[PDB]
Design an enzyme around this catalytic site. Structure first.
Site, PDB file in Angstrom:
ATOM      1  N   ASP A  12      48.493  34.518  33.376  1.00  0.00           N
ATOM      2  CA  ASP A  12      47.039  34.507  33.276  1.00  0.00           C
ATOM      3  C   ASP A  12      46.598  35.702  32.436  1.00  0.00           C
ATOM      4  O   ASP A  12      47.415  36.391  31.816  1.00  0.00           O
ATOM      5  CB  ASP A  12      46.391  34.499  34.667  1.00  0.00           C
ATOM      6  CG  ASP A  12      46.724  35.731  35.472  1.00  0.00           C
ATOM      7  OD1 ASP A  12      47.882  36.184  35.408  1.00  0.00           O
ATOM      8  OD2 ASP A  12      45.827  36.246  36.170  1.00  0.00           O
TER       9      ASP A  12
HETATM   10  P1  LIG Z   1      41.972  35.417  33.249  1.00  0.00           P
HETATM   11  O1  LIG Z   1      41.096  34.697  32.255  1.00  0.00           O
HETATM   12  O2  LIG Z   1      42.460  34.538  34.362  1.00  0.00           O
HETATM   13  O3  LIG Z   1      41.057  36.521  33.965  1.00  0.00           O
HETATM   14  C1  LIG Z   1      40.441  36.186  35.238  1.00  0.00           C
HETATM   15  C2  LIG Z   1      38.998  36.670  35.274  1.00  0.00           C
HETATM   16  C3  LIG Z   1      38.953  38.143  35.675  1.00  0.00           C
HETATM   17  C4  LIG Z   1      38.396  36.528  33.887  1.00  0.00           C
HETATM   18  C5  LIG Z   1      38.179  35.807  36.230  1.00  0.00           C
HETATM   19  O4  LIG Z   1      38.237  34.484  35.748  1.00  0.00           O
HETATM   20  C6  LIG Z   1      36.740  36.158  36.583  1.00  0.00           C
HETATM   21  O5  LIG Z   1      35.903  36.285  35.697  1.00  0.00           O
HETATM   22  N1  LIG Z   1      36.451  36.304  37.869  1.00  0.00           N
HETATM   23  C7  LIG Z   1      35.137  36.632  38.396  1.00  0.00           C
HETATM   24  C8  LIG Z   1      34.592  37.909  37.840  1.00  0.00           C
HETATM   25  C9  LIG Z   1      35.278  39.088  38.478  1.00  0.00           C
HETATM   26  O6  LIG Z   1      36.461  39.037  38.732  1.00  0.00           O
HETATM   27  N2  LIG Z   1      34.556  40.169  38.747  1.00  0.00           N
HETATM   28  C10 LIG Z   1      35.105  41.362  39.357  1.00  0.00           C
HETATM   29  C11 LIG Z   1      36.117  42.003  38.465  1.00  0.00           C
HETATM   30  S1  LIG Z   1      35.808  43.741  38.088  1.00  0.00           S
HETATM   31  C12 LIG Z   1      36.463  44.449  39.537  1.00  0.00           C
HETATM   32  O7  LIG Z   1      36.639  43.820  40.545  1.00  0.00           O
HETATM   33  C13 LIG Z   1      36.964  45.828  39.359  1.00  0.00           C
HETATM   34  C14 LIG Z   1      37.094  46.471  40.674  1.00  0.00           C
HETATM   35  C15 LIG Z   1      38.305  47.370  40.747  1.00  0.00           C
HETATM   36  C16 LIG Z   1      38.591  48.140  39.506  1.00  0.00           C
HETATM   37  C17 LIG Z   1      37.537  49.151  39.213  1.00  0.00           C
HETATM   38  C18 LIG Z   1      37.979  50.203  38.253  1.00  0.00           C
HETATM   39  C19 LIG Z   1      37.651  51.591  38.675  1.00  0.00           C
HETATM   40  C20 LIG Z   1      38.840  52.474  38.784  1.00  0.00           C
HETATM   41  C21 LIG Z   1      39.096  53.252  37.543  1.00  0.00           C
HETATM   42  C22 LIG Z   1      39.247  54.700  37.790  1.00  0.00           C
HETATM   43  C23 LIG Z   1      39.397  55.480  36.543  1.00  0.00           C
HETATM   44  C24 LIG Z   1      40.724  56.141  36.533  1.00  0.00           C
HETATM   45  C25 LIG Z   1      41.696  55.352  37.363  1.00  0.00           C
END
Ligand SMILES: *P(=O)(O)OCC(C)(C)[C@H](O)C(=O)NCCC(=O)NCCSC(=O)CCCCCCCCCCCCC
Ligand SMILES: CCCCCCCCCCCCCCCCCC(=O)OC[C@H](COP(=O)([O-])OCC(O)COP(=O)([O-])OC[C@@H](COC(=O)CCCCCCCCCCCCCCCCC)OC(=O)CCCCCCCCCCCCCCCCC)OC(=O)CCCCCCCCCCCCCCCCC
Ligand SMILES: CCCCCCCCCCCCCCCCCC(=O)OC[C@H](COP(=O)([O-])OCC[N+](C)(C)C)OC(=O)CCCCCCCCCCCCCCCCC
Ligand SMILES: CCCCCCCCCCCCCCCCCC(=O)OC[C@H](COP(=O)([O-])OCC[N+](C)(C)C)OC(=O)CCCCCCCCCCCCCCCCC
Ligand SMILES: CCCCCCCCCCCCCCCCCC(=O)OC[C@H](COP(=O)([O-])OCC[N+](C)(C)C)OC(=O)CCCCCCCCCCCCCCCCC
Ligand SMILES: CCCCCCCCCCCCCCCCC[C@@H](O)O[C@H](CO[C@H](O)CCCCCCCCCCCCCCC)COP(=O)(O)OCC[N+](C)(C)C
Ligand SMILES: CCCCCCCC/C=C/CCCCCCCC(=O)OC[C@H](COP(=O)(O)OCCN)OC(=O)CCCCCCC/C=C/CCCCCCCC
Ligand SMILES: CCCCCCCC/C=C\CCCCCCCC(=O)OC[C@H](COP(=O)(O)OCCN)OC(=O)CCCCCCC/C=C\CCCCCCCC
Ligand SMILES: CCCCCCCC/C=C\CCCCCCCC(=O)OC[C@H](COP(=O)(O)OCCN)OC(=O)CCCCCCC/C=C\CCCCCCCC
Lengths: 54, 99, 52, 459, 69, 178, 128, 174, 87
Positions: I42
C-alpha cells in the site's frame, strides 16, 4: 531611494521650478491677440509710469 | 502600423566571418594592425617607458636636499648647545608690535 | 517587443481598471491587489506576499 | 603647455583627413603619444608651481589630472570604436572630434592660470558632453538627462560668474598667484556669505553635492560608454579642483559656512551607499558609488587641512580610474545582452573567466583595499576628519562597511551563481575589451607603487 | 573511459594574455638590461663639495645617472 | 523535479508526505538504527490506526492535529542529504556546468583538437533542426483552444518523431561535469 | 496541548499550519486550477522560445521589464503629497542632518572651549 | 660607517658578550652561520667587489645646492609682490627643512626604543625629551596654519603669540 | 574517486533491498512486479520502500517523483537517469 532621492529631491528643485516656469509661460502666452485688450494694457502702463515713477 | 520603418537588425558577430578576431574592426588586416598598434604603443611605450621615466624622475621636490640640510642644521645646533628647532619663525627684533 | 500598454500604470480606481491591471501582470483578478494609494508611487503594481 | 595643447588641435585635422578605416587607429596611436608627452608634467617642484607663461601654469594638483585626461582619451576611443561600428564615416569623425574637443577643453581648464579663463573653459566642457549624450545615447531618456545635467550645472555656475567679475572689480585681478599672495581675510557679513555661497555652490553642483546630484544618475546612466567614462573620471573632478583653487580667498568664513555642506556630504554618502545596496540597475549603482566617493572628497575639502587635500587628490585620481573601469565592464556586459538589468545576466564567472577576474580586481579597488591609492586617499580623509571631530569616524566606518557590502554584492550578482539558461549570445571576451581592462587597471597598481605623484602640492 | 569536458572558449583569453605579456616584455626586458648595465658600470655619483669658483649644472646636482640624463 | 505538479495535493498525498517527513525527523532524533526501527514501527502503527476513517472531515482534523504535533516536535537541525537542498554539498558543482552553445563558440583550433566529438555533435544538431517543425506542430495540434492547463508534455506519437521540447532535457549538463 | 507557534513578519507561518489549507471550498479548487493554467501557459511560451533552434539572443521578460520600470521610472508620476508622505520625507531627509549638525557643533564647541582654557592635551599632535 | 654622520645619527657602543659555552654539544647556530658565510657572504662579497671595481673606473661627482638668505616677510613691504614671492619661497624651504629635522629626531627616538628593548622606558628618556622639545616648537610654529598656509599667516600667528606673551608678562609684573 | 555506477549494479542493489524487505516474498519478486497490483503493498509501504532506496543510494527522491515509482524497473530507470548512468 524612493522617498528622498526619487520623490522629494525631485519635487524641491527641478520639478517645482519647472512647474512654475510652465505656469508662468502659459499665463504670458495665453493671449487672444486683441488690440483693444493690450492697448488698454498700454494705457494702464502709461499711467503707472507717469504716476509711480518720479 | 503607423510608419514604413526598417525592422531591428540582428546583432552582428565578428567571430562569424573572422574566427581569430580581436574585436577592433570587420576587416581582418585593419583589425590585426589596430590590435598591434594599440598593444605596442599603449602597453610597451606608455606603460613601461612612462613608468620608468616617473621612477627615475629627478629629485626636483628637494626631498634629499631637505634631508641633507636638516642633517647639517642638526649637527651645527647640537654641536653648539643651540635648540634643534627654533621657537620663532621670524625675528622679534624685526617684528614691531603695536602698543 | 513590449507595447506601451504593458507597463505599470496609475492606481486602478474601477473594476475595469483592476481587471485590466490583473490581466497585464498575468495574474487572476481575485489574486491581484495593488499597494494602498498612499501617494508613495507604487502605482498598480501588485502586492505579492512578503515571502522569499 | 602648448607642446600638449597644439598636438590635440592637430589631432582634429588628422581625424578629419584620415581614411575611413584608419580613423580609430590614427586617433588611438596619437592619443597615446600625446599622453606619453604629457607624462613630463609629473616632474613638479617642491616650492612653487610650474609657470609656463602668463596664461598657462602647472601644479602638483593639475599634473595628475592632465595625465589622467590624456590617458583616458584612448580608452574612450576603444570603447567608442566598439559600440559605433555601423555609424557613417562622417558621424564617426564627428564623435572623435567631440572627444578631442572635450580633452582640449579639459587640458586648458586644468592649466588655466586665471579664474575667469578657468570658468570659461570649465563651462565650455558642457557643449561637447551635451552633444555626445543627447546624440549618441541609446535610450529615450538621454534628452531629459542632458537637460537635467545642463541646467543643474548652469544654475550652479552663473552666480559663480557674477562672483568672479565682482571679485575682479574689488581686488583688481583674478590671477590665481595674485589672489593667493594678496589674499585678505573674509569678514563675517551677509555679502561675504553670499559670495562664498555663489562660489562653493557652483562647485558643489559640479561635484555633485548630495541633494544636487540627480543629474549624475540621469546623465551617467543614459550617456554612451565614452560619455560615461569621461563624466566620472574627469568631469566630476572639476568641482574638487575648483574648490581647492577657490578656497584661498574664502577664509576664515569657510570655518563657519562648511557645517551644512559637511553634514549633507556625510549623511548623503551614507544614503547613497545604502541606495547602491538596493539598485536594480548596474549603471545606477556605479553612479551612486561615484556620488558617495565625491561626497567624501567634499568632506575633505571642506575640513580643509593639509592632510585632507592630499587624501582628496589621491581619492579623486583613484575614483576616476576605478569608475572608468567599472563603466567599461558594465558596457561590455550590456553589449552582450542589450540590457542594463543587473540580475538579467548571471554566471558570467563561468561564462567569461578573465572578465570575471577584471570584475574582481575592479571591485577590490572600488572598496578601499590596501595598499591601493583608493585606500590611501580614503584613509587620509578619514584621519583628517577624525582630527576634525571624533564622530566622523563613526560615519566613515558605516560608509566603508556599506561600500564593501554593495561592491561585493555587485560582484556576486553579476559573476557568481548560475548562468541564465536562455541567454546564449555571450561570445568570448574580445582582445580589445581585455586590453581596455588591463590599461585601466595597471596604472592604478603602478600609482600604488609610487603614491607621492598623486598627493598634491601639500605633500 | 574518458568523457568530454564542456568548457567555454579559453583560446581568446590565452591569446590576449600571451600578447599582453609579450608586449610588456618587448620593452620591459631591454629596459631591465639597460638599467642593470648602467647600475653595474656607470654607478651613482659621489657627493662632494663644490669647488670654489665653479658653477655646476642641475644634472650635476642630481645623483643617479638616469635622473641626471 | 521531473514530474509536472498538479493544481493541488490530495488528502492521500498530504498524509503520505507528512508520514515521510515525520519518519525522517524521527530518524534524526533516534540516531541509532534499532531505536529508529522501533519508533518507526510505532509511528506506522499510529498511521494504521487512523488508516480507516469514513468521515473525511474527521480525517482532515486528525491530519491538522498531526501537523501541529510535528511542527512542535520537529528536530531543529534535521538530517539532510548532502546533495539535497539543505545539504552541505548542495549546488557545489553549478559553477562547472557549461552548455553546448558555449561549446560551439570555440576557435577552429580548439574544435580541431577533438575531431570525432564534433562530428557527433553536428549529427545531433542536424537531428534537432530536422525535428523542430514537427515538434511545434504536434504541440499546437494536441493543446486545447484555451491553452495548456498543465505543464505535462506529450510523447512522440509517430515512429519518425521525437518528443517535443526535448533538446535541453537531453543535453542538460552532467551531474558531475568536470 | 502543545504550545502554539506565533508567526511573525520575518518568520512566516508554515504552509502545513495554515488553517486555510484544511478548509478547502470548491471555489478554491477552481482558483487553483486557474492559477495552474496561467503558470502552464507562461511555461509553454518560455519553453517554446527556449527550445527554438533558430533563436540567438535573450528571451525578453515583460515581468522583469515591468519590475525594473516600476522600481525606477513609475515612482514619481504616482506620487501625491499627503500628510504621511510629507511627514516621512521631512523626518528622513531633515532630522538626520540637524541631529548630526547638533552633535558635531557641540563636540567642536567643547573642543574650542578646552583649547581656549588651555587644559587640553595637544602634545605630540603634529599632524592635522 | 662613513655614509652618515655618527653625531647626527647617534648610536651607543655595542657590547656583545663573549660566548662561554657550558656543554659538550655542538652549536647548530655556529655551524649554520659558518655555512651561511661560506655559501652566501663570500659570493655576494665577490660580486660587490667586482661592482665597486667597475664603479671606481668611471668616478664622477654630484653636489649639494646652496641657497643664500633673502629678506623675509617681515622685511617685505606691503603688496610688494617680488619680495613677497622670495620670502614665501624661503619660508617654504625652511618649513621643509624643519619637517626633516622633526623626522630625524623621530627616527632617533624609534631606533633608541628598539635598541634598548625591554628597558626602553628608562634608557630612552634622553631621546624622548629631545623629541618633546622639537615637537613642541614645531607645533607652535606650524600648528593650525591651514591648507592654504603662507608666510603671512605664520607671521600673523607669531604676532598673536607674542602679543599674548607680552600681555601675560605685563600682568605678572603688574 | 568513487567507481561509476552501472545499470546492472543499480538493479542488483534495488533488488537486494527489496528482497531484504520482509513484506515481499523474494521468490515471486521480479524487476517488473508492481508494488500495489501484484505485490499487495500500500501507500505507506511504498513510502518506506522509497525511503529505503534513498538510504541505499545516498540521495533524496522528491515526493512528487517518489509517488510514481511503482516498479523496481521504474526505480532503476529514475536513479540511473538522475545519476547519469548510461551503460
Ligand atoms: P495508501 O493510499 O493506502 O494510504 C492510505 C491513506 C493514509 C491515504 C488513507 O487512505 C486515508 O486517507 N485514510 C484516512 C485519512 C487519515 O488516515 N487521516 C489520519 C492520518 S494522519 C495521522 O493519523 C498522523 C498521526 C500520527 C503521526 C503524527 C506525526 C507527529 C509525530 C512527528 C514528530 C516529529 C518528530 C518525530
Ligand atoms: C609579465 C607581465 C608583468 C606585468 C607587470 C605589471 C605592469 C608593469 C609595467 C611596467 C613597469 C615598469 C617599472 C619600472 C621600474 C624601473 C626600475 C626601478 O625602479 O628599479 C628599482 C631598483 C633600481 O635601483 P636603482 O636606483 O636603479 O639603483 C640601485 C643602486 O643605486 C645601484 O645598484 P648597484 O650599483 O648596487 O648594482 C645593482 C645591480 C647589480 O646587482 C646585483 O648584481 C645584485 C645581485 C648580486 C648577486 C651575486 C651572487 C653571486 C653570483 C655568482 C656566484 C659565483 C660563486 C659561487 C660560489 C658558491 C659557494 C662556494 O642590479 C640592478 O641594477 C638591478 C636592476 C633591476 C631592474 C628592474 C627592472 C624591473 C622591470 C622593468 C620593466 C617592466 C616589465 C617587466 C620586465 C621584467 C624583466 C625581468 O631595483 C630594485 O628595486 C631591484 C629589486 C630590489 C631587490 C629585490 C627585492 C627585495 C625585497 C625585500 C623586502 C620584501 C620582502 C617581503 C616580501 C613580501 C612579504 C612576503
Ligand atoms: C645605446 C643604445 C641604447 C638603446 C637605444 C635603442 C634605440 C632604438 C631605435 C630604433 C627604434 C625604431 C625601430 C623599432 C620600432 C619597434 C618595432 C618592434 O619592436 O616591432 C616588433 C613587434 C612584433 O613584431 P611582429 O609580431 O609583427 O613580428 C613577429 C615576426 N613575424 C614577422 C615572423 C611575425 O612589432 C609589432 O608588434 C608592430 C606594432 C606596430 C609598430 C609600429 C612602429 C612605428 C614606428 C616606430 C615608432 C616608435 C615611437 C615610440 C614613441 C616615441 C619615442 C619615445
Ligand atoms: C518648503 C519646504 C522646503 C524644505 C527644504 C529643505 C532643505 C534641506 C537641505 C538644505 C539645508 C541643509 C541644512 C542642514 C542642517 C544644518 C544647518 C547648519 O549647519 O546651519 C548652521 C550653519 C552655520 O551656522 P552656525 O550656527 O554654525 O554659526 C555659529 C558660528 N558663529 C557664532 C560664528 C556665527 O548656517 C549656515 O551655514 C548658514 C548659511 C546657509 C546657506 C544655505 C546653504 C545650505 C546648504 C544648501 C544645500 C542645497 C542642496 C540641498 C537641498 C536641495
Ligand atoms: C657586457 C656589456 C657591457 C660591456 C662593458 C665593457 C667595459 C666598459 C668599461 C667602461 C664603461 C664606461 C665607458 C664610458 C664612460 C662615460 C659614460 C658616459 O657617457 O656617461 C654619461 C653619463 C654620466 O653622467 P654625467 O653627469 O657624467 O654626464 C656626462 C654626459 N656626457 C659624458 C655624455 C657628456 O651617464 C649617462 O648618461 C647614463 C647612460 C644614459 C642613460 C639614459 C639612456 C637612455 C637610452 C634611450 C632610452 C629609450 C629611447 C627610445 C624610446 C623608444 C624606443 C622604441
Ligand atoms: C603573472 C604573475 C604576476 C605577479 C608577478 C609579476 C612579475 C614579478 C613582479 C613583482 C613586482 C612586485 C613589486 C616590486 C616592485 C619593484 C620595483 C619598484 O619597487 O620600484 C618602484 C618604482 O616606482 C615607479 O615610479 C612606479 C611607476 C608609476 C607609473 C605611473 C603610471 C605611468 C603612466 C601611465 C599613464 C596612466 C596615468 C594614470 C593617472 C596618473 C619604487 O620606486 P623608487 O624606489 O623610488 O625607484 C628607485 C629608483 N630611484 C632611486 C632612482 C628613484
Ligand atoms: C607626440 C609625438 C612624439 C613623436 C612621435 C614620433 C613617432 C611617430 C609615430 C608614427 C606613427 C606610426 C604609424 C602608425 C601605425 C600605422 C598603421 C598601419 O601600418 O597601417 C596598416 C598597414 C597598411 O594598411 P592595411 O592594413 O594594409 O589596410 C588595407 C585596406 N584595404 O598594414 C600593412 O599592410 C603594412 C604592413 C607592412 C608595414 C610595416 C610597418 C611597420 C611600422 C614601422 C613603419 C614606420 C617607420 C619608422 C619611422 C620612425 C620615425 C621616428
Ligand atoms: C532666481 C530666480 C530664477 C527665475 C527663473 C529663471 C530660470 C531658473 C532655472 C529654470 C531652468 C529652466 C527649466 C525649464 C522649465 C520649463 C520646462 C517645462 O515647462 O516643461 C517641464 C519639463 C518636462 O515637462 P513636459 O512638458 O511633460 O515635457 C516636454 C517638454 N517640452 O521639464 C524639463 O524637461 C526640465 C527639467 C530640468 C530643468 C530643471 C533642472 C533643475 C533646475 C536647476 C536647480 C536649481 C534651480 C534654480 C532656482
Ligand atoms: C535664497 C538663497 C539664494 C537664492 C538665489 C537666487 C538667485 C538670484 C538672487 C539674487 C541675489 C540675492 C542677493 C545676493 C547678495 C548680493 O547680491 O550681494 C552680494 C555682495 C554684495 O555686494 P555689495 O553691493 O558691494 O555690498 C555692499 C557693500 N557695501 O556681492 C557679492 O558678493 C557678489 C556675489 C554674487 C552672488 C549673488 C548670488 C549668490 C547667491 C546664490 C547662492 C548660490 C547659488 C545657488 C544656486 C541656486 C539658484 C537659486
Amino acid at each position: 531611494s524612493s522617498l528622498l532621492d526619487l520623490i522629494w529631491l525631485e519635487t524641491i528643485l527641478p520639478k517645482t521650478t519647472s512647474f512654475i516656469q510652465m505656469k508662468m509661460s502659459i499665463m504670458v502666452s495665453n493671449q487672444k491677440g486683441l488690440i483693444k485688450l493690450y492697448f488698454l494694457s498700454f494705457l494702464i502702463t502709461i499711467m503707472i509710469s507717469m504716476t509711480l515713477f518720479n | 502600423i503607423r510608419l514604413q520603418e526598417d525592422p531591428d537588425p540582428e546583432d552582428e558577430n565578428l567571430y562569424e566571418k573572422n574566427p581569430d578576431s580581436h574585436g577592433y574592426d570587420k576587416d581582418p588586416i585593419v583589425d590585426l594592425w589596430n590590435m598591434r598598434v594599440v598593444f605596442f604603443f599603449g602597453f610597451s611605450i606608455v606603460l613601461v617607458l612612462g613608468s620608468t621615466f616617473v621612477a627615475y624622475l629627478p629629485d626636483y621636490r628637494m626631498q634629499e636636499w631637505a634631508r641633507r640640510e636638516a642633517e647639517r642644521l642638526v649637527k651645527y645646533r647640537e654641536a653648539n648647545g643651540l635648540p634643534l628647532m627654533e621657537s620663532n619663525c621670524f625675528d622679534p627684533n624685526k617684528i614691531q608690535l603695536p602698543e | 517587443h513590449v507595447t506601451k500598454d504593458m507597463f505599470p500604470g496609475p492606481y486602478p480606481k474601477t473594476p475595469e481598471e483592476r481587471a485590466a491591471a490583473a490581466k497585464k501582470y498575468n495574474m487572476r483578478v481575485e489574486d491581484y491587489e495593488p499597494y494602498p494609494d498612499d501617494g508613495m508611487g507604487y502605482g498598480d503594481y501588485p502586492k505579492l506576499p512578503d515571502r522569499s | 603647455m602648448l607642446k600638449i595643447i597644439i598636438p590635440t588641435t592637430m589631432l582634429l585635422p588628422m581625424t578629419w583627413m584620415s581614411k575611413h578605416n584608419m580613423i580609430w587607429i590614427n586617433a588611438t596611436v596619437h592619443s597615446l603619444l600625446i599622453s606619453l608627452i604629457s607624462l613630463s608634467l609629473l616632474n613638479q617642484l617642491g616650492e612653487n608651481s610650474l609657470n609656463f607663461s602668463l596664461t598657462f601654469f602647472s601644479d602638483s594638483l593639475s599634473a595628475p589630472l592632465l595625465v589622467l585626461t590624456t590617458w583616458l582619451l584612448p580608452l574612450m576611443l576603444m570603447a567608442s570604436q566598439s559600440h559605433l561600428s555601423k555609424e557613417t564615416t562622417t558621424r564617426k569623425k564627428l564623435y572623435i572630434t567631440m572627444l578631442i574637443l572635450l580633452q582640449l577643453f579639459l587640458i586648458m581648464t586644468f592649466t588655466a592660470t586665471e579664474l575667469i579663463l578657468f570658468y570659461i573653459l570649465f563651462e565650455a566642457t558642457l557643449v561637447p558632453t551635451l552633444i555626445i549624450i543627447t546624440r549618441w545615447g541609446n535610450q529615450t531618456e538621454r534628452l531629459n538627462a542632458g537637460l537635467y545635467f545642463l541646467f543643474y550645472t548652469l544654475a550652479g555656475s552663473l552666480p559663480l560668474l557674477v562672483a568672479l567679475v565682482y571679485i575682479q572689480n574689488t581686488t583688481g585681478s583674478l590671477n590665481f598667484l595674485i589672489i593667493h599672495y594678496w589674499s585678505h581675510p573674509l569678514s563675517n557679513s551677509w555679502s561675504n556669505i553670499f559670495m562664498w555661497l555663489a562660489c562653493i555652490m557652483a562647485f558643489m553642483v559640479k561635484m555633485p553635492l548630495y541633494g544636487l546630484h540627480l543629474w549624475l544618475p540621469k546623465a551617467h546612466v543614459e550617456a554612451p560608454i565614452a560619455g560615461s567614462m569621461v563624466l566620472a573620471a574627469v568631469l566630476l573632478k572639476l568641482g574638487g579642483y575648483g574648490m581647492m583653487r577657490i578656497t584661498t580667498i574664502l577664509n576664515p568664513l569657510t570655518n563657519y559656512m562648511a557645517y551644512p555642506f559637511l553634514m549633507l556630504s556625510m549623511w548623503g554618502m551614507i544614503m547613497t551607499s545604502s541606495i547602491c545596496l538596493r539598485q536594480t540597475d548596474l549603471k545606477s549603482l556605479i553612479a551612486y558609488s561615484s556620488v558617495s566617493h565625491m561626497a567624501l572628497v567634499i568632506v575633505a575639502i571642506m575640513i580643509q587641512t593639509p592632510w585632507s587635500f592630499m587624501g582628496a587628490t589621491a581619492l579623486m585620481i583613484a575614483h576616476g580610474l576605478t569608475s572608468s573601469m567599472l563603466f567599461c565592464l558594465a558596457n561590455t556586459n550590456y553589449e552582450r545582452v542589450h540590457s542594463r538589468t543587473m540580475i538579467l545576466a548571471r554566471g558570467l564567472q563561468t561564462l567569461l573567466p578573465l572578465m570575471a577576474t577584471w570584475w574582481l580586481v575592479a571591485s577590490l579597488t572600488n572598496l578601499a583595499l590596501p595598499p591601493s591609492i583608493n585606500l590611501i586617499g580614503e584613509l587620509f580623509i578619514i584621519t583628517a576628519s577624525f582630527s576634525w571631530s571624533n564622530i566622523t569616524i563613526i560615519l566613515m566606518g558605516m560608509n566603508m562597511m556599506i561600500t564593501a557590502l554593495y561592491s561585493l554584492y555587485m560582484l556576486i550578482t553579476t559573476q557568481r551563481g548560475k548562468y541564465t539558461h536562455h541567454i546564449n549570445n555571450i561570445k568570448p571576451s574580445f582582445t580589445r575589451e581585455n586590453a581596455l581592462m588591463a590599461l585601466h587597471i595597471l596604472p592604478l597598481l603602478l600609482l600604488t607603487l609610487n603614491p607621492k605623484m598623486i598627493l598634491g602640492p601639500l605633500y | 573511459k574518458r568523457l568530454f569536458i564542456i568548457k567555454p572558449s579559453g583560446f581568446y583569453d590565452r591569446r590576449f594574455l600571451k600578447l599582453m605579456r609579450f608586449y610588456i616584455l618587448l620593452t620591459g626586458i631591454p629596459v631591465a638590461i639597460g638599467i642593470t648595465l648602467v647600475n653595474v658600470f656607470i654607478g651613482e655619483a659621489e657627493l662632494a663639495d663644490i669647488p670654489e669658483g665653479y658653477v655646476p649644472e642641475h644634472w650635476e646636482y642630481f645623483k643617479h645617472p638616469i635622473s641626471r640624463w | 523535479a521531473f514530474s509536472a505538479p498538479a493544481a493541488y495535493l490530495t488528502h492521500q498525498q498530504k498524509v503520505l508526505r507528512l508520514y515521510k517527513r515525520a519518519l525522517r525527523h524521527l530518524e534524526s532524533w533516534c540516531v541509532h538504527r534499532d531505536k529508529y526501527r522501533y519508533f518507526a514501527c510505532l509511528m506506522r502503527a499510529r498511521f494504521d490506526e487512523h488508516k480507516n476513517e469514513k468521515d473525511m472531515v474527521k480525517a482532515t482534523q486528525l491530519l491538522r492535529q498531526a501537523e501541529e504535533e510535528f511542527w512542535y516536535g520537529q528536530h531543529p537541525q534535521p538530517y539532510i542529504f548532502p546533495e539535497s537542498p539543505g545539504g552541505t554539498s548542495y549546488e557545489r558543482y553549478e559553477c562547472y556546468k557549461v552548455p553546448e552553445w558555449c561549446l560551439d563558440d570555440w576557435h577552429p583550433s580548439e574544435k580541431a583538437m577533438y575531431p570525432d566529438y564534433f562530428a557527433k555533435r553536428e549529427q545531433w544538431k542536424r537531428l534537432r533542426r530536422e525535428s523542430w517543425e514537427r515538434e511545434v506542430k504536434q504541440l499546437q495540434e494536441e493543446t486545447p483552444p484555451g491553452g495548456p492547463r498543465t505543464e505535462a508534455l506529450p510523447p512522440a506519437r509517430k515512429e519518425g518523431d521525437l518528443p517535443p521540447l526535448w533538446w535541453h532535457i537531453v543535453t542538460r549538463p552532467r551531474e558531475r561535469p568536470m | 496541548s502543545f504550545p502554539k507557534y506565533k508567526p511573525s513578519r520575518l518568520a512566516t507561518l508554515p504552509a502545513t499550519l495554515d488553517p486555510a489549507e484544511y478548509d478547502i471550498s470548491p471555489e478554491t479548487r477552481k482558483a487553483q486550477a486557474e492559477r495552474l493554467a496561467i503558470r502552464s501557459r507562461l511555461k509553454r511560451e518560455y519553453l517554446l522560445q527556449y527550445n527554438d533552434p533558430n533563436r540567438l539572443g535573450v528571451i525578453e521578460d515583460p515581468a522583469l521589464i515591468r519590475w525594473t520600470y516600476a522600481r525606477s521610472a513609475n515612482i514619481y508620476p504616482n506620487f501625491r503629497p499627503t500628510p504621511k508622505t510629507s511627514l516621512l520625507g521631512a523626518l528622513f531627509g531633515i532630522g538626520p542632518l540637524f541631529f548630526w549638525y547638533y552633535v558635531f557643533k557641540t563636540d567642536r564647541d567643547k573642543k574650542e572651549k578646552l583649547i581656549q582654557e588651555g587644559k587640553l592635551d595637544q602634545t605630540f599632535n603634529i599632524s592635522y | 660607517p662613513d655614509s652618515w654622520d655618527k653625531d647626527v645619527y647617534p648610536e651607543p657602543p655595542r657590547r656583545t658578550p663573549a660566548p662561554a659555552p657550558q656543554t659538550s654539544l655542538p652549536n647548530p647556530v655556529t655551524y649554520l652561520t659558518k655555512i651561511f658565510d661560506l655559501l652566501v657572504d663570500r659570493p655576494v662579497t665577490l660580486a660587490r667587489e667586482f661592482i665597486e671595481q667597475q664603479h671606481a673606473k668611471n668616478r664622477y661627482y654630484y653636489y649639494h645646492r646652496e641657497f643664500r638668505r633673502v629678506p623675509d616677510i617681515t622685511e617685505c613691504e606691503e603688496k610688494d609682490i617680488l619680495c613677497m614671492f622670495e620670502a614665501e619661497m624661503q619660508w617654504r624651504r625652511d618649513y621643509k627643512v624643519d619637517q626633516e629635522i622633526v623626522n630625524i629626531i623621530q627616527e632617533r627616538l624609534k631606533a633608541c626604543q628598539q635598541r634598548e628593548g625591554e628597558s626602553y622606558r628608562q634608557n630612552c628618556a634622553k631621546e624622548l625629551e629631545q623629541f618633546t622639545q622639537v615637537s613642541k616648537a614645531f607645533q607652535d610654529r606650524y600648528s593650525d596654519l591651514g591648507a592654504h598656509y603662507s608666510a603671512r599667516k605664520c607671521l600673523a600667528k607669531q604676532k598673536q603669540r607674542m602679543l599674548a606673551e607680552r600681555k601675560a608678562a605685563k600682568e605678572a609684573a603688574a | 574517486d568513487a567507481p561509476p555506477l552501472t545499470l546492472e549494479a543499480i538493479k542488483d542493489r534495488v533488488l537486494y533491498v527489496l528482497k531484504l524487505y520482509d513484506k515481499i516474498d523474494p521468490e515471486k519478486l521480479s524487476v517488473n512486479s508492481h508494488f500495489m497490483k501484484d505485490l499487495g503493498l500500500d501507500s505507506l509501504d511504498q513510502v518506506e520502500i522509497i525511503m529505503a532506496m534513498e538510504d541505499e543510494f545516498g540521495f533524496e527522491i522528491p515526493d512528487i517523483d517518489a509517488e510514481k515509482l511503482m516498479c523496481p524497473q521504474e526505480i532503476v530507470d529514475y536513479i540511473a537517469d538522475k545519476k547519469d548512468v548510461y551503460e
